[PDB]
Amino acid sequence: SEKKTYLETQLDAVMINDQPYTVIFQRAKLKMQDPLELEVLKEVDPCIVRDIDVSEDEVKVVIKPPSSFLTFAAIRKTTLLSRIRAAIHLVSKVKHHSARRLIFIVCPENLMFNRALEPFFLHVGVKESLPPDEWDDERLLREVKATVLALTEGEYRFDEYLKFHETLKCSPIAKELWQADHLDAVLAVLEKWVDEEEAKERAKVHIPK
Ligand SMILES: [Cl-]
Ligand code: NA
């Protein structure tokens, strides 16, 4: 019937709407003490508006990106070269922790893109308050690898790359990406890839010869 998505499962929350994005958490299940801890969510990024309602039993976040932002599946339709550049910007955005209590969960359902293929997150956690509510660099690294493979290689869904990559049809650069030790080595693998792919696209505007 209705399976919960990776986001839903990791947040233990319900996506009740996608127009506009709306996430519903049970207050009883949160580490949140003072609802004021969630005010930081008003200050994630100037493009995407987030309205927060802390009621006696639930916390509701309503997330409204600009109407001209592109979904993950829209970027998946662009050129390989373009998708790898997008993936580089993603890895560059999450490479570090926030100093302002914000914690990032990376998956295709949680991302939208601006006109310059800059990624933005929809839902963001708050340390010790709202899931994801703790750092876990390993979890973030795996999500990023799966999300980047889903965007670039794109021969499987995010969940399948995430969950199952040791059992599926691994490609050479993909293999390099899973292999990578940390986000910087993910970024190095991508950089050699975008160079390779840029040389290929350029060859298409010269006629040898
Ligand atoms: Cl050229
Ligand atoms: Na750590």
Residue numbers in the entry: 2 to 210
Lines from the paper:
The architecture of Geobacillus thermodenitrificans EssB has been investigated by combining crystallographic and EPR spectroscopic methods. The protein forms a dimer that straddles the cytoplasmic membrane.
We determined the crystal structure of EssB-N using a construct comprising the entire predicted cytoplasmic fragment (Ser2 to Asp214). The structure of EssB-N was determined at 1.7 Å resolution. The asymmetric unit consists of a single polypeptide folded into an elongated structure, approximately 55 Å long and 35 Å wide, which consists of two domains. The N-terminal domain is dominated by a four-stranded antiparallel β sheet. The C-terminal domain consists of a helical bundle formed by two antiparallel helix pairs, α4/α5 and α7/α8. An overlay provides a Z-score of 10.4 and a root-mean-square deviation (rmsd) of 4.4 Å for an alignment of 173 Cα-atoms. These values suggest a distant evolutionary relationship but the catalytic residues are absent from EssB-N. However, at the C-terminal inner surface of the EssB cleft, as well as at the domain contact area, a remarkable degree of structural similarity is evident (Zoltner et al., 2013). The transition to a monomeric state appears to be influenced by a combination of low pH and high ionic strength, which matches the crystallization conditions used for EssB-N where we may have been selecting out the monomer.
